[PDB]
Design a protein around this ligand. Structure first.
Ligand SMILES: Nc1ncnc2c1ncn2[C@@H]1O[C@H](COP(=O)(O)OP(=O)(O)O)[C@@H](O)[C@H]1O
Ligand SMILES: Nc1ncnc2c1ncn2[C@@H]1O[C@H](COP(=O)(O)OP(=O)(O)O)[C@@H](O)[C@H]1O
Ligand SMILES: [Mg+2]
Ligand SMILES: [Mg+2]
Lengths: 621, 49, 621, 49
DNA sequence: GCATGCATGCGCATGCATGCATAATGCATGCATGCGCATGCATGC
DNA sequence: GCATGCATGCGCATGCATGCATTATGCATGCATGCGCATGCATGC
């Protein structure tokens, strides 16, 4: 086609507007460093805040939201121009670059249930869960052929979705020469791009109760191929378009609507160094004390939860042997001792946390399963709760109600951290390294003091050895303790959020002091802010300490001392048996304490703290 | 093809393609309705629409 | 169409070969100056000798003659490259340049009768006469349109004969926008090229006697539009191709063959300055003496013919008055005095010479005619012999046999030099400035001496006054004159061309002396070569002399003397009457003599020579 | 159009055009012949071929 | 531990929207040339 | 000069190669889901 366009006021003006938008010379803009980062990382697309564009140029934002394709084309042209300007050499590699979108879209923030034809041809944002995914497939863009008879090579260009409507003249694969000499395809010189299709469903938590769900279909291009997986909660921003049906005579008048993604999102130094170096022991002291103001007392359980948050060190050797580094805890107590509050707080704070109660999930939904795909006849693996929580936390409330077979299944995860799966036609070893919290009621409803803990717990020695720590909590009815508990509870109850009028319906390292949440006496001390706590926890989890020679003999001698004291402990009973796992638990707790205070080696104080914890947990009066 | 072309060669048979990006669209739904149980005759299967 | 070609050995090698062909750096080539001349003259095509190409590269010449289109494309690409190289600015004006061909094609030199399908797709050369021509018509190449509704302008490109076969998708004129908004054509911005069609017939002189002629059809492109006219003898070099018929189902299998022209040809200082400045009078002396060695004696007739060759000066004034500058001569003599030999020699030597005998051409075929074109119903003008011979020579043998009406028609050409033509619907004044030679036999077969020349000539005084000069030639049977004539004739008869073996079947200013053609006695003098004679005649015809005050009174007094001597001439009769035309004849002959010797002004000697000629011609014993 | 095209859309009706530059050509002539005057029957018009 | 219940799971039929395959004949127009006519030019006597 | 011959010239009919105009219906395939079957897991007593 020889038709060309000479002038177009709108397109030229829009391109000029984007050129001025992405200059960042007389402004505090950052996009220049973003482009330099893209050049450094060999990536070929940019993400631009919609709110930023609206602030700088409201008319362009309005036009882009109301009309997508032409404005996106102008964006891509402007990106090509500026990439050529900054570094023309890098722009040679890729044909055209792409634009992502970000920011608060406002009215266009639309649920899969509320997508309508009113938003067609516009850019929309949607939040959902992923249910179906397809295999990655290549697609031809540029084809190259060679003719052995005449020693000539030719090239053909393809453009199918670049243009809105395609015709039979295009998309034809050449096979013969002008004189019927055969052509040989040369796959090395051709160009291909990847293609994938996914399906998104409205989350069951958001859908109205008792109603069937509604879903949308998404196409993922070459860059965003591997960014999504089934069973995942995502947010997708992209165009909403109609699908051209293939040629025919009579049409019913109903198109197919498909969302074409442009952005896919998985929804989620000096201060730290100074604080750590100055505090050392006070680091873990305050972190244990400031774990959760909403919960009263129970310092040992807070210490244990902090040890889970920091964790041990995974180790590997020459022979391929694996040594576990995770910690596991079981709490048993009387009703209303706030075990479930602790579980919920750990769910909120931990990065990868999944709650799975006793009978809520069975043995199949915990680890994994194998299903025969009807579409192809092959065998596929579906991951369970524990496989999804790799290097994460699984919380199990009402642990006693869980059946025996489920606990035998959990043995594989608790011992080695791997899951072996096999059915005729497929077999695999999946990684499931994880940590477990569990809370179980006593068998008699309330913990009996006179009976030994073995009768009350009612669990076999193997399962007890599987757990690193056992804790027993009691509701002692001391008048002064009850007074303290009532004071704390009513102080929390009377508190109201600042900035909210009374009677209405419904970052510094240390938190600001509060008259009610802290109290007048506590003015001499402060609590650590949640955000800094999370940052410090992440940094500590990164750090890799090493064990010293001073503490190894000390810990070994104390383990031997405990195994000999087994005969000496005559006035009290033992909660858990002492096996070879106890020594690994000692080393693990020592390393966790060494993680608490940023350093390079494990010292004696960490071993002493670990041993104090072990002595407290393993024996009771 | 309804174009006056004299001297020019003419278009083939069935030359038309639907352009999807240049159409007006509206919402569409189908529902299934059942006869009220209060008025269904005794011993008769309910009817649908 | 997205199909492209990456490699082609033959085309690239041919382009490289032409690049090396047109370099002219380490060679004595001239094409660089040719390109510079083309840039100077704003022309956009080149002519290249085929024999030169064959000498430099025989394989390329063979391929070009055997295969035309691809090789011509390579030539045009190479021209574009070198025009860009020498001056890239000039190459911007024109899309692509073109190549002409020249030289001896040899076997491919083909008559319109001998063109066959064996020469299809090759470059051929043909010699013929032009019979039909068509009006010049523009053709669209690039179209430009504007939309007042959306203020957008678009452009469409057309390429019909650039590609061998065209399809209905192309050659479509746009009239509506994508949203049916009307478009307004803007003829200023579009591009057009001229187009013409001509027909060529084999010349009747070359065709076998008694057989019907055969013709070829030629298409003339934008550059060669005005290079041909009907009734013209031309040589055309170009491709010979088939013509694609328009679409259909059933075909008889017979194509139309059309020749596409690439070249159209109309078939045809120090020495001069030194010779003229040194010789002066001897210039015309030798030119008269060396006019034609094949003819014996008759110095006066040779002088008169030389005066025709040089001619007078055309003059114009303020009031639009025109003054004739041509000369006219009539010879009357006994049989075998070589009048027709003189006419044939003047035909051979003069640039534009046309022979038209007495009854060979009538009054209509002499001047012009008007014909009603059946194709359009309009009136068209067809030029006769005298209109074609503008600023030329018409030779009329057997002038006495011409009818009276034809001579009355010739009056208009002889007096003013123009032809007035009129028929209801059209009227014109055509230019016919010309000079006439005429030879007429005496009425009595042989010239009678005793009777006055008026009885012998038998022509009215008006026609005699129309002619500038009258000459009478006689065959006197003097024994010594007969001996001289026999010597000359037999010397010419015994002569043989040098380089030709005896008995076989069938540039220096001064000609080399010959033993027989000149003789032993004539060694003291030499004759002027024909080529230098033609060059000098052309240069003299260019020169524009001016009349001096010295000779005007002298000539006027001699004219009065002649008109008074009219009573004094009692012993002899007068051949021609003395009218006002005699004075103009005197001035004309004076200016012709002044042309003979290159100078700036007319002198007295030229007037004396003119008067001697007049005295000799106007009276006889 | 005799090409195997699955998934691709198909060519229209009557899609063929004659290529003139890729054909072999030979010379062609027609003549008119008359019966010999030596053998034409008396009083009969001659025949042609 | 053995007897029973049962939520999961698999393979082949029909129903229904889209999609795929087929496929010469008759009528109209411009170029070439015959046949009747009147004007006009040229040629004798 | 007047009487005659006549090569040129013009308008409307037919004959013949190319060229132009026309134009829905029937059959096939993959997606959704019912119905019979055997294995196997989980739950009581
Ligand atoms: N140490 C404590 N500090 C503050 N509140 C507590 C404490 N112990 C119990 N509570 C209160 O008692 C309630 C116990 O509920 P829950 O955590 O479900 O108990 P359990 O998990 O033992 O069944 C909570 O709402 C909590 O507010
Ligand atoms: N002066 C001359 N010089 C040479 N040859 C002459 C001369 N006069 C006559 N002839 C010869 O006589 C012949 C005359 O033939 P031509 O020119 O036809 O005579 P005309 O033209 O008088 O009928 C020519 O062939 C020529 O060779
Ligand atoms: Mg609870
Ligand atoms: Mg003669």
């Amino acid at each position: 086609a020889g038709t060309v366009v000479l002038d177009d006021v709108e397109l030229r003006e829009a391109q000029r507007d984007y050129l001025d938008f992405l200059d960042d010379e007389e402004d505090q803009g950052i996009y220049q460093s973003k482009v330099r980062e893209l050049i450094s990382d060999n990536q070929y697309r940019l993400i631009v805040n919609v709110n930023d564009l609206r602030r700088k140029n409201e008319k362009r934002a309005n036009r882009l939201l109301n009309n997508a394709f032409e404005e996106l084309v102008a964006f891509q042209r402007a990106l090509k121009d500026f990439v050529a300007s900054i570094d023309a050499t890098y722009a040679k590699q890729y044909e055209e670059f792409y634009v992502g979108l970000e920011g608060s879209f406002g009215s266009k923030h639309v649920s899969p249930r509320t997508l309508t034809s009113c938003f067609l041809s516009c850019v929309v944002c949607v939040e959902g869960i992923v249910t179906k995914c397809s295999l990655v497939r290549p697609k031809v863009v540029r084809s190259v052929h060679y003719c052995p008879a005449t020693k000539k090579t030719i090239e053909r260009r393809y453009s199918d979705l670049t243009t809105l409507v395609a015709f039979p003249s295009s998309s034809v694969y050449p096979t013969k020469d002008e004189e019927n000499n055969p052509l040989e395809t040369e796959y090395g010189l051709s160009v291909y791009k990847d293609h994938q299709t996914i399906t998104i469903q409205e989350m069951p938590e958001k859908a109205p109760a008792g109603q069937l769900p509604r879903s949308v279909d998404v196409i993922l291009d070459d860059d965003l191929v591997d960014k999504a997986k089934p069973g995942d909660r995502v947010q997708v921003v992209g165009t909403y378009r109609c699908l051209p049906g293939k040629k025919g005579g009579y049409t019913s008048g109903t198109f197919r609507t498909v969302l074409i993604a442009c952005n896919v999102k998985q929804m989620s130094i000096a201060k730290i160094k100074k604080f750590s170096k100055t505090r050392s022991k006070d680091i873990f002291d305050q972190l244990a004390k400031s774990l959760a103001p909403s919960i009263h007392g129970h310092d040992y359980v807070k210490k244990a939860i902090l040890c889970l948050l920091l964790g041990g060190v995974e180790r590997d050797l020459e022979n391929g042997s694996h040594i576990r580094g995770d910690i596991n805890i079981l709490l048993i107590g009387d009703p209303s001792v706030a075990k479930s509050q602790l579980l919920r707080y750990v769910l909120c704070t931990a990065p990868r946390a999944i709650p799975t109660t006793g009978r809520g999930s069975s043995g199949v939904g915990l680890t994994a399963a194998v299903t025969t795909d009807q579409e192809t006849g092959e065998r596929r693996l579906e991951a369970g709760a524990m496989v999804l929580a790799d290097r994460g936390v699984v919380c199990i409330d009402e642990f006693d109600k869980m059946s025996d077979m489920d606990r035998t299944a959990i043995h594989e995860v608790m011992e080695q951290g791997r899951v072996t799966i096999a059915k005729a036609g497929i077999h695999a070893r999946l990684n499931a390294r994880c940590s477990v919290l569990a809370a179980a009621n006593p068998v008699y409803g309330r913990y009996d003091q006179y009976k030994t803990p073995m009768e009350n717990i009612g669990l076999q020695d193997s399962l007890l050895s599987r757990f690193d720590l056992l804790f027993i909590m009691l509701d002692q009815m001391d008048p002064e303790q009850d007074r303290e508990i009532s004071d704390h509870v009513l102080r929390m109850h009377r508190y109201r959020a600042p900035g909210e009028q009374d009677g209405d319906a419904m970052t510094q390292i240390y938190e600001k002091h509060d008259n009610l949440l802290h109290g007048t006496k506590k003015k001499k001390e402060k609590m650590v802010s949640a955000a800094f706590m999370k940052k410090y926890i992440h940094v500590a989890k990164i750090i890799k300490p090493v064990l010293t020679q001073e503490s190894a003999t000390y810990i070994a001698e104390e383990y031997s001392r405990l195994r000999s004291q087994d005969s000496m402990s005559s006035d009290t009973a033992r909660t858990s048996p002492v096996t070879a796992r106890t020594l690994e638990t000692l080393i693990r707790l020592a390393t966790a304490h060494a993680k608490a205070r940023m350093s390079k080696t494990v010292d004696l104080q960490d071993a002493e703290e670990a041993v104090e914890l072990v002595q407290y947990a393993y024996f009771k009066k | 093809c309804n174009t006056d072309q004299a001297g020019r060669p003419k278009c083939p048979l069935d030359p038309y393609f639907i352009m999807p990006d240049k159409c007006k669209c509206v919402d569409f739904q189908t529902l299934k309705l059942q006869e009220l149980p209060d008025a269904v005759p005794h011993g008769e299967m309910p009817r649908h629409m």
